[model samples]
Target chain A: DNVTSSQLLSVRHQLAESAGLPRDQHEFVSSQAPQSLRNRYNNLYSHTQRTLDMADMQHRYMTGASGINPGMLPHENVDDMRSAITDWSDMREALQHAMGI
Target chain B: PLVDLEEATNNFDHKFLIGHGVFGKVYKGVLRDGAKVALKRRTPESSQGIEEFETEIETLSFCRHPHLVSLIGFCDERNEMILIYKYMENGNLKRHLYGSDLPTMSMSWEQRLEICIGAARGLHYLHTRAIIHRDVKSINILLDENFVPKITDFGISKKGTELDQTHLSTVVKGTLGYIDPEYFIKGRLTEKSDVYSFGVVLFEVLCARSAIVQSLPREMVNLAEWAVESHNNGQLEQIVDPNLADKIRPESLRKFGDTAVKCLALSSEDRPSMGDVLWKLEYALRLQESVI
Candidate 1:
């Protein structure tokens, strides 16, 4: 519910408020960009609990979880098919170190 | 955010209206800076109107493009659905094509092709970005100085389109005869459906005819049916816009005509890819250039 409004809400509406975009362009959010922002937000939120995202990845790896099926994800190219999309462990740790959340 | 619909057109006066549709009317307005803009205010309705208002606002806020009519701004307060945009001095493409106001000034074949080319480029960008234009037709294609085309009317847009799947089935909303039969039959719309409409637009430029003619004899059906079957029968010369036939290079005209016919093929696979259409259009242009 929270994801639908505050944090994940794209600036598209804000643009539409000022610019009368035609009907076709009414929904043009690049999910990749917002998901990145959400990750940073979640990273700090997770740090508040005194935890690490890598821990989740490790548990998933050991259990063969589908948490982040990075390799099989859709892409213009097929060569990067097998690469795993682990949580951005490095970014989350850096955020934790900086914010001390 | 500074847009005040109540004050802009005195609540959408008919005098300021350039046009109106199922969504609402567009009123011509002028900013303090002397820049002219058009304001689209939703029609009055209770529940669904409100939902449509929200949908329009929400969609415009996200999507952005140049050849597209930009939603410069919108307002949700005062129970009004309003959007602001730069007003095109020249009006929608359909009126320009058929309206007597501009008939004295003819659009040369080259000019018409360029207009279609510009519309195609804008839509190609949208399709590549994963957006589907559920409605692509003349009324939605706006024109500017030198007859350049800008696509508008996105009320029927959808996303995550598949090659053969319809995107908008909730409603059968679209401009007249230009609607893709594939969409009409399957009750589903997809990006390729838009390509189909663009094909009709090509025919429009070629034959200078309207897409839907409700009163046409049952035998003709629509422009696609009449032109596609009759075009190859040497009657194409009868259909080609006389004003443009003399101006168009035979080879280029043939290429464009042939490509447009293929684009309208009943089988979606037989239709040329938009990317291929773009290449063919360029080839036609170059062929025209060599004519001199």
Candidate 2:
């Protein structure tokens, strides 16, 4: 969660900085640059995490995995969560490098 | 890089002179290596003179892109200043669009999009490297045998040291019709200035007309302004090239018109970057391809 929040914040910050570019440059970045990649990951992270939580709740409001009568979350997809987090990390690293942040 | 341009152009023969404009005379020359090139000879009365010549050499010497005309050699011996570039056989976009002497060259919708996208890529690359092509117009766009467009004539190009800073204030220098309104009024040059000229070029490609025909009626004198007005009124189709009228996809035309409109926006702040223009152009092409 800490890593996720930091990465999202970095992208949001860069976008705001990018917004300060002159009219021509700003238009270019806003229209064509891959500024949406960060947000794509951010939304995906929240969505996939929410899905996991909702799936757990659907299983008779399941308890934690450590509970005595715990039930496995339905439609659980570990790969989706892993890939989303991985993509977020990669985007954060690249954005920081590109922007020299 | 000084060269013996005399021998290259058959002793600077008048017959080899292929073009003449505000800058100087452009001669078709063949070097000793059997390579054909366009020799841009600077004349005493040239509008953009020695400073422009030096900037041309300095800017184009190290830069190489598929969309830019390759600068092959230079002749700075004695008082002569000549720049040699790869000879573009099909000449420039202006001739194809409006030259009376030239036989009609029918350009398809796809070709127009391809040429524009190529030019935008060239400009986008220049912007990324901190270079502003002060002059961006259809006249400066040349075509090789295959009609591959090349951005040429870097006489008034300037370099911006710091990226994402602001406009570069300089003397007003550009063709009359294609000049950015903001730059002309304030002398505050920027990459967006070039964007403005290119916006005119985009409208030119769509409408197949000169930048400005003074002889035309008052409302139609300036193509860029006329295009923007027509676009806003949902009458862009009225100004579209007659040749491409039926051929152009509606969706693609809409996107292309929208892009051109954004480019000609009164405020440079509203103009799309070369990169964005390139994207919109490519998108237009993709849309056309679906129907073609």
Candidate 3:
């Protein structure tokens, strides 16, 4: 019921390791792309980070332990996290391919 | 009011086509009076039907505000439904914020703050009339030559009996990232839902990102959560557009961010009404002005 930042980071790290990619996602992204791609990399990082934040907060908020009112249906929060997972997987794959991992 | 629709759009030529999406296509047209207009052409076969067309026309007809897009006319000839609007010379707000594929441009702090305030005022007017604009996103906010915000796209707008509020859904309607989480979960659409969506737009303006980006890491998919987390982590200024560096002060950012967070609260009841949102935005503008 406790979803934390390190917890989400571990998920992404594992995905990268499984694909023979580097653990430091941002570093790998920087090494692989040109200067013009800096903005693109930051944008990608922000996208993934924001998704995890939403999924985690919504999970905590609905769990009744975060002091936030539980408003979402159980299944709805599940779907939200599921989409975040999908986004994570897709981003990892793109990173790996871009880095030739 | 049936002029030659074909002639107006140059025979619906692709050259005149400016935009198109799930509902229909939008074209640039000139009326017989030589008035340039945005001709939104909706196919009968499109998911939306005459009921929505009527609603849009009726919605625009009753609503008139400096911040609201004005409907010029419509063509229902040959079962082809078309809506005519005053051409927004500067186009929608999203392009300016997120640097659309068309062309990416950055807005000054004053422009961005003013744009959001205008949008909130438009929403305030709509709520005052007991109307709920089911869809409120950057794409729906048209920008005039002076960057004045005009809220458009009222196809799914609802006019409730007593006050403001929802209807007709096999599934929930609204863009993914901008959709109100509370409305999505409960299927209870209200002006608060619109507020939530507007909150997402507010964050987009601050961060210069879209509501949802599949390319981002899982944690960063939604802009609302990202903005909240970033602000909470004391990186609020970092997430702001680089182009806006040194322009937005801590006080102004806090005011804007706090208002957005209030609007994005998990419960619709927790969200501020558009009336309140408009007032808060004005207050944020004043704060921004002081910083300037």
Q: Candidate 2 lDDT, tens digit per residue, B238-266?
A: 55564665788888888998898888877
lDDT of 2 by residue, A7-48 (tens): 333433443333222344334434445565545444544554
**CAPRI docking class of candidate 1:** incorrect
Q: Name the TM-score of candidate 1.
A: 0.65
Query: Model 3 over residues B1-292: C-alpha lDDT tens digits?
Result: 2332322232344445566543456888765677778877787234335666888887888646989998877777776888888889988887787655653457788889899999999998898887888788888899998899999988778777666543323235566577777777777777787899899889888878753434335566567777777665557546545467777777878888889888888988788988888888888788854423
DockQ of each: 0.01, 0.01, 0.04
- Compared with the real two-chain complex, what DockQ does model 1 have? 0.01
Error of 1 at A80 (Å): 61
- Considering the two chains of model 3, state its CAPRI-style docking category: incorrect
True contacts kept of 1: 0.00
Model 1 regions more than 4 Å off: A1-101, B1-15, B45-47, B62-64, B161-171, B232-238
**Is candidate 1 or 2 superior in TM-score?**
2
Per-residue lDDT tens digits of candidate 3, residues A1-101?
Answer: 32333454455444333332246655766565634644544564455455445445544432322322222333444455555556556656666665663
lDDT tens string, model 1, A33-101? Answer: 233454544433333222222223222322333222111112211111111112233343444444342
lDDT over C-alpha atoms for residue B275 of model 3: 83
Clashing pairs in 2: none
Q: Any idea what lDDT model 2 has?
A: 0.68
Worst 10 residues of 2 chain B by lDDT: B1-10
Model 3 chain B TM at 0.88
lDDT string for model 1 (B166-246, tens) is: 345544445545666776667665667777778888877777774444232555646666667755555655454635546
